[PDB]
């Protein structure tokens, strides 16, 4: 029996485990670390990826330019050097995007008129949000229906306000410029269902959005979050408004913490990060670029003027940020400052840092200070998350970029304390024993302050590769192939990793192409064909599809498909195929002496493909083994159909026969056809017409189409009959066969067949079995030995089965065979039928082409027409490689005054 101590041990254990779980729950709600899983951006000078931003920052580049000339601004009237002159700007320089007007409207399902009415902030947020999710290695379509939240800093800049009122039945003018819709439209178009909020606290807006997103994630309200801000100056209003105040730097430069600092330099930017609980990123296998530890927001309160900063409030928000995540100021290596280059604000910011991080600071490790604004200017609502981008890029590349224009630090700050040093040059910042951390500040003119703590992320052959690319237009398809071509021309390039990334991290769009390749060089050759709109090589296939799934039929033909060594490659390259073959030989064992595997390999002393009694069991094994290979790639038949003994493969695949019983039926039937050797013939060819012609004789096996038919009978009549058709018109192709099937010649063997095979026990079919004998869907239990004799005996109504299935809504027809013998007849029948007019028909292997590459090419052909394939099964052990983002096909949309 249990002592009192043994029982107390269990109760006290439960109480301390309850406590531990409660404490963990508190710490999740309060301070759960948040993974930055990816980033995206549009910044001045064509800086349209985070890597380009890093490239700019590592060189010390400054992207300042003249005012745009393609936005309808009146540049002559707009400039005037006197600050007090109404309606003008004394600066003519800013940070402007390359192509603020460019948008791929059709990609996003937006009409041309809606696009023109849309604020470019909204349009570039759609592109960057798509890129953002692609850069996380996530198929954006997989976020449809998820609780992904959207948290954006965005304000109106007057787009469209000086355009003549027009008609607008659809209300495009209202939704096109509303900041609420800037966030809501991302949710709408990507099918996101978490909260979607636009916020405005001026310059701190995007870090306030980040603070709210972190809250939403810690509470479990959002599963992931799209976070950032957008500022595109559609009108010059901000240069005019701030000119009246002499608030702008005359040369346009943001000289943060330099003695030259003399006002703002304003810029455009659209910057986003994707956030998730770190523990959730690890669970889901998402990359983690860095971690948000903590953040704080407060207000200046009663400052010396509405828009004046408050040193004491900045001190407090710094301390609150560090305290919210349990860190000390000494834990922080560097600050990405608000750093606007104003003469009043730079000293107050620096003094607040000197008084928090700089107090009692390790003499050998001052706080590093800089500002991305010195490179790219002040991106307004996007400013805070833009500084976060720099921090993450600096962490990932092991280096703190220089901040510009500090050759003389401002003398309005007493740097003598020595606790804070400006990044006058780049500084190594390598992963090591000391955990790397940095902070980002943003302090808005409405007085709301943000400080966020960011930490490094926690320490973390020659076979055929199917490469699948897709896009929403043909031009975008060519671009996507050309981008992958360039990627694979690199040495860094992991062929299999690229294929797996293409298959699992990218949305599958309507225009689709695929290359099956074993080397990078072959892959590039095939992708270059796609990039030119061609598909001439055999390893390249293209199509277009409006659906992403099909109702699939597996078709199993009879004889005619075989060829010497068929499937031999697949024994080595495909365990699924060989496993099924081996299973076939175990069940064929107590009925024959030879082995199917030995025939396919063409072993020594192994039978050849001339004896009906070896061909049919081989082809059966090949077919049911190709069926299993298709099924391991995720292609499940919704129905099966067989032609003559192909029905036996069909019935096994459907589940109606065990493999033991199907082997009996095929070996049984196949020997008994050997008996009738030399005693029959068959040949090919309308049904009613051919039956008139056959009255003179008493020797019709199959109806494959309205002009394709098979006649069977005695050798004599066979030739006599051909002479007539010979000396009259259409051809009569013989058939390599020693016998005459589906004719009365069969009756003599009825008795033995049935007794030999009468032992079988058919089961219910798990997959619709549409009989070509009785022209209907049949319960598997009806498929007893009597049925299998009636299949040998009666006429194969193949075309009618296809037709019936086309007309019932099946739209993918897969010939599961080593060589395509019914594809044409299926195609013709599907066309004439009142069934789907976009059906697909494909085979499995070809006489020349029975290796895994040919099989992958067949699956590719099915896929570019909408059959879903699990391509990762082809790429075991690969890791997904980072890819370029979607090649948007842009036109200009701009409402002009």
């Amino acid at each position: 029996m249990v002592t009192d101590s043994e029982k107390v041990a269990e109760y006290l254990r439960r109480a301390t485990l309850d406590l531990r779980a409660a404490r963990q729950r508190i710490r999740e709600l309060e301070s759960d670390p948040i993974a930055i899983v990816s980033m995206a951006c549009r910044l001045p000078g064509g800086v349209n990826t985070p890597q380009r931003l890093w490239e700019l920052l590592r060189e010390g580049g400054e992207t300042l330019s003249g005012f745009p000339t393609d936005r309808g601004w009146d540049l002559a009237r707009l400039h005037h050097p006197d600050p007090d002159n109404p309606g003008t700007s004394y600066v003519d320089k800013g940070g402007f995007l390359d192509d603020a007007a460019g948008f791929d409207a059709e990609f996003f399902g937006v009409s041309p008129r809606e696009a023109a009415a849309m604020d470019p902030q909204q349009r570039l947020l759609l592109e960057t949000s798509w890129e953002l999710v692609e850069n996380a290695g996530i198929d954006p379509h997989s976020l449809r229906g998820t609780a992904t939240g959207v948290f954006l800093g965005v304000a109106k800049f007057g787009y469209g306000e000086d355009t003549a009122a027009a008609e607008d039945v659809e209300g495009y003018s209202v939704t096109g410029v509303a900041p609420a819709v800037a966030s809501g439209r991302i949710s709408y178009t990507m099918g996101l269902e978490g909260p979607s909020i636009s916020v405005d606290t001026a310059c701190s807006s995007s870090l306030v959005a980040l603070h709210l997103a972190v809250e939403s994630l810690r509470k479990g309200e959002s599963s992931m979050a799209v976070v950032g801000g957008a500022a595109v100056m559609a009108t010059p209003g901000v240069f005019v408004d701030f000119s009246r105040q002499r608030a702008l730097a005359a040369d346009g430069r943001s000289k943060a913490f330099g003695a030259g600092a003399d006002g703002f330099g304003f810029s455009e930017g659209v910057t986003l990060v994707l956030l998730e609980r770190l523990s959730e990123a690890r669970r889901n296998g998402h990359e983690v670029l860095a971690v948000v530890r903590g953040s704080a927001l407060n207000q200046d309160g009663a400052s010396n003027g509405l828009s004046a900063p408050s040193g004491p409030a900045q001190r407090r928000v710094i301390r609150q940020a560090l305290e919210s995540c349990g860190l000390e100021p000494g834990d922080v290596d560097a600050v990405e400052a608000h750093g606007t280059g104003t003469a009043l604000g730079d000293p107050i910011e620096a003094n607040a840092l000197l008084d928090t991080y700089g107090r009692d600071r390790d003499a050998d490790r001052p706080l590093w200070l800089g500002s991305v604004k010195s490179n790219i200017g002040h991106t307004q609502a996007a400013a805070g998350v833009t500084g976060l981008l720099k921090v993450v890029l600096a962490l990932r590349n092991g280096e703190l970029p220089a901040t510009l224009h500090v050759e003389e630090p401002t003398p309005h700050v007493d740097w003598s304390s020595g606790g804070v040093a400006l990044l006058a040059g780049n500084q190594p910042w390598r992963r090591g024993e000391r955990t790397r951390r940095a902070a980002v500040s943003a302090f808005g003119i409405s007085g709301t302050n943000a400080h966020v703590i960011v930490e490094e992320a926690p320490e973390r052959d020659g076979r055929p590769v199917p490469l699948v690319v897709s896009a929403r237009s043909t031009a975008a398809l060519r671009a996507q192939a050309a981008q992958i071509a360039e990627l694979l021309e690199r040495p860094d390039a992991d062929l299999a990793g690229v294929g797996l990334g293409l298959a699992t991290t990218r949305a599958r769009h309507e225009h689709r192409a695929a290359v099956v390749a074993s080397t990078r060089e072959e892959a590039v050759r095939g992708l270059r064909e796609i990039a030119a709109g061609a598909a001439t090589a055999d390893a390249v296939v293209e199509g277009v599809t409006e659906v992403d799934g099909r109702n699939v039929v597996f078709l199993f033909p009879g004889q005619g498909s075989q060829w010497a060594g068929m499937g031999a490659e697949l024994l080595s390259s495909s365990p699924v195929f060989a496993g099924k073959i081996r299973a076939c030989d175990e069940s064929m064992a107590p009925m024959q002496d030879w082995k199917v595997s030995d025939v396919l390999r063409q072993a020594p002393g192994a039978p050849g493909l001339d004896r009906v009694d070896v061909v049919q069991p081989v082809l059966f094994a090949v077919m049911v083994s190709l069926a299993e290979l298709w099924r391991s790639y995720g292609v499940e038949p919704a129905a099966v159909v067989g032609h003559s003994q192909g029905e036996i493969a069909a019935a096994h695949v459907a589940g109606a026969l065990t493999l033991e019983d199907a082997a009996k039926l095929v070996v049984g039937r196949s020997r008994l056809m050997r008996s009738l050797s030399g005693e029959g013939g068959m040949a090919a060819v309308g049904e009613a017409a051919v039956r008139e012609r056959l009255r003179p004789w008493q020797d019709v096996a199959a109806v494959n189409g309205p002009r394709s038919v098979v006649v069977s009978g005695e050798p004599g009549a066979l030739r006599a009959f051909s002479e007539d058709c010979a000396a009259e018109g259409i051809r009569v192709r013989d058939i390599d066969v020693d016998y005459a099937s589906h004719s009365p010649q069969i009756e003599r063997v009825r008795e033995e067949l049935l007794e030999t095979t009468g032992d079988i026990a058919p089961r219910p079919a798990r997959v619709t079995f549409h009989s070509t004998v009785e022209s209907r869907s049949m319960d598997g239990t009806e498929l007893d030995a009597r049925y299998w004799y009636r299949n040998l005996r009666e006429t194969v109504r193949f075309a009618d089965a296809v037709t019936r299935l086309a007309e019932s809504g099946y739209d993918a027809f897969i010939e599961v065979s080593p060589h395509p013998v019914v594809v044409q007849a299926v195609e013709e029948a599907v066309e004439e039928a009142d069934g789907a007019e976009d059906a697909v028909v494909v085979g499995s292997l070809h006489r020349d082409g029975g290796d895994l590459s040919a099989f992958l090419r067949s699956m590719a052909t099915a896929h570019v027409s909408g059959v879903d394939i699990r391509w990762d099964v082809a790429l075991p052990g690969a890791a997904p490689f980072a890819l370029p983002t979607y090649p948007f096909q842009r036109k200009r949309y701009w409402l002009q005054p």
Epitope: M1, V2, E10, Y11
Partner: antibody, heavy 118, light 114 residues
Framework: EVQLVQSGGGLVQPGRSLRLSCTAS????????MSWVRQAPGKGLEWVGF??????????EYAASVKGRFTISRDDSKSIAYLQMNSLKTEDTAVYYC?????????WGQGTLVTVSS | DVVMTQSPLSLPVTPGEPASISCRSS???????????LDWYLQKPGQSPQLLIY???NRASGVPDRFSGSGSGTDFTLKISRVEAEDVGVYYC??????????FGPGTKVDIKR
């Protein structure tokens, strides 16, 4: 999260043997006593036996109805508890639950049906 | 000298409304350490048993906080503040003063009032 995954039962003839396993995950298996409890179809829950953790000697106790036929063991490296059932009888037919704890049964496996029939 | 518990044989309940299950032991379950050695379990139909309450009135992590227990000595109650339809099944009060427990007993069959 805590999991107790049970396997190894099914149909067995009288007089024969079966070994049930309970594979634990998400906690330190070696710190817990583990118990077996069974439920004949449509009846109540009957205690079968239990094994102590190594911290308390690793020993077992058994209901008188199974003593000398059933034995419990554990593998702390694989985090598995076993119920070895010999000389099975028709009245042993039951769903067999593994549970964490010898006194407080704070987490239960999904159960394994054992049917003894000729 | 064997320690048994008894609870009502059946108990119809109404979702939205409270429910109480009483338990009486043949012997005080109050230990010198101050706790009553009485635990409550639930077996939902076709599911395995689950723990609800331990040592009389402690609710295990993850159990819905509509469940509580009280009592002392020989008399105990499991209370559901507002019954849900998913709460039907068999409730068991189990003493832990004397071990092993050979049986869980007949328990209290909770079903929907009508």
């Amino acid at each position: 999260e805590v999991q107790l995954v049970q396997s190894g039962g099914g149909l067995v003839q009288p007089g024969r043997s079966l070994r049930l396993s309970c594979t634990a995950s998400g906690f330190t298996f070696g710190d817990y006593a583990m118990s077996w409890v069974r439920q004949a179809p449509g009846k109540g829950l009957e205690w079968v036996g239990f094994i102590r953790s190594k911290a308390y000697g690793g020993t077992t106790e058994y209901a008188a109805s199974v003593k000398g036929r059933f034995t419990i063991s554990r593998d702390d490296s694989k985090s598995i508890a076993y119920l070895q059932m010999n000389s099975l009888k028709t009245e042993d037919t039951a769903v067999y639950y593994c549970t964490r704890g010898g006194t407080l049964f704070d987490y239960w496996g999904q159960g394994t049906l054992v049917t003894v029939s000729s | 000298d064997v320690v048994m518990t008894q609870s009502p044989l059946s108990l119809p309940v109404t979702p939205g409304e409270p429910a109480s299950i009483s338990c009486r032991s043949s012997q005080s379950l109050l230990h010198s350490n101050g706790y009553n050695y009485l635990d409550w379990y639930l077996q939902k139909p076709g599911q395995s048993p689950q723990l609800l309450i331990y040592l009389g009135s402690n609710r295990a992590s993850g159990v819905p906080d509509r469940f509580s227990g009280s009592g002392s000595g020989t008399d105990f109650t499991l209370k559901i503040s507002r019954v849900e339809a998913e709460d039907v099944g068999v409730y068991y009060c189990m003493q832990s003063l004397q071990t092993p427990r050979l049986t869980f007993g007949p328990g209290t069959k909770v079903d929907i009032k009508r």
